[PDB]
Curated annotation (Swiss-Prot):
This is Glutaminyl-peptide cyclotransferase. Belongs to the glutaminyl-peptide cyclotransferase family. Glycans are attached at residues 29, 260. InterPro entries: M28_QC, Peptidase_M28, QC/QCL. It is found in: Secreted. It comes from the Eukaryota. The keyword Secreted applies. Detected in salivary gland and midgut. GO terms for biological process: peptidyl-pyroglutamic acid biosynthetic process, using glutaminyl-peptide cyclotransferase. Its EC number is 2.3.2.5. Keywords: Acyltransferase, Disulfide bond, Glycoprotein, Metal-binding, Secreted, Signal, Transferase, Zinc. The gene is Qptc. Changing residue 210 to A: Abolishes catalytic activity. It comes from Ixodes scapularis. The active site is at 155 (proton acceptor), 210 (proton acceptor).
Amino acid sequence: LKWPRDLRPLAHHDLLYMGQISEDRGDFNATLRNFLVPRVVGSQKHREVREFIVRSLKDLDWDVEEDCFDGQTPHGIKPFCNVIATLNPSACHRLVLACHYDSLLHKEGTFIGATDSAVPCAQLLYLARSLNGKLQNQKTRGDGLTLQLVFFDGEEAFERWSSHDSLYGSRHLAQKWHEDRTSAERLESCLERSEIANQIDRMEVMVLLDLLGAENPRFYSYFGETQPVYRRLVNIESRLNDAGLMELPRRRRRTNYFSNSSTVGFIEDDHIPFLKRSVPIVHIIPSPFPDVWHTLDDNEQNLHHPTISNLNKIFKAFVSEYLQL
Ligand SMILES: [Cu+2]
Ligand SMILES: [Cu+2]
Ligand SMILES: [Cu+2]
Ligand SMILES: [Cu+2]
C-alpha cells in the first residue's frame, strides 16, 4: 500500500543550498533564546512565549489560530492555548509539523526544557522563516497541499500519568478536528481518491519533533504506516553527508541519526488522540532519550549546536522535498 502522494526526490541544487547554513545561524539562535525560559502552564512567561510564536508566524503572512480551552488537571481547572498556523488554510491536505511549547513543572526547581521542547519549537519557526520565499511561492500553485505547524500546549504531565492527567492540547485538538465535519467538495484540490469526512482527515502526515538538541540522537521508524516518509529523512541525511554538508567533530565522519532499521515496536500511547483517529505519524524523537531528559540539566549550555544545525538541514530539505519546493 503506497503513500497517497508521489515522491519527487529533492533537486541536487536544493540539497546543496539547504545544506550550507550561511548566518541563518543568528536568526536561529535569536529565535531559540526566546524559548529558553520556564514555560509553565498558565504563567506569564508561557503566555509571552505564545505571543512570540503567534507574532512570528503572522509576520510571515500565515493564518494563525489560538485554540484556547480549559482542562481538568489535578491542580484544578487550568487554561491552555494551542497555536495552529496554516500557510494556505484552503489547501485540502496539510503536511503538519508539531511540538509542544509548555515546559514540565519540575518537582526539584526551575526546568528550562531546552531539548524538551525549546529547540523543537525554535526549529519550527526557523523552518517557516528560512523557507518563506519558496513556501509563499508553493502556496499559490493550487495543488491542494500546504504546510501547517501545531505548537501544542499542556502536553507534559503533572503526576504519575493517570490516563486522565496529560496531553491536554492534543486530546482537545484531536477531538475538535475529528468533530468538525467537511468533505472534498468544500476544499481545494483534494487528491483524487481521498476520503475527507472531517478536519482531521486533512492531516496528511503529522511530523512530531521532541527531545532534540543533545548530541548524537538515534531515531528509528516508530510507525510502519509512515515508513515511506521516514525513509526520505534517512535518504536526505545520507545525501547531506555524501555532499560533505554535516558538521562532524573530525574529518571523514558521518552522522547516522536516522536508523535504516526495520520499524521498531515501542509503546506509542501518547499519540493516540491522533492514532485512534487514523492520523499517520512520524515521531522524530530519540531512542534512548537524551541523558538530560527531565533533569534540571536540560538547559542552554547542554545543547549541541552542531547536531542542531545538522538536524535543521535535514528538516529543511525534508520539508522542501515533501512540498516540492
Ligand atoms: Cu531550488
Ligand atoms: Cu516534551
Ligand atoms: Cu518531557
Ligand atoms: Cu512516538
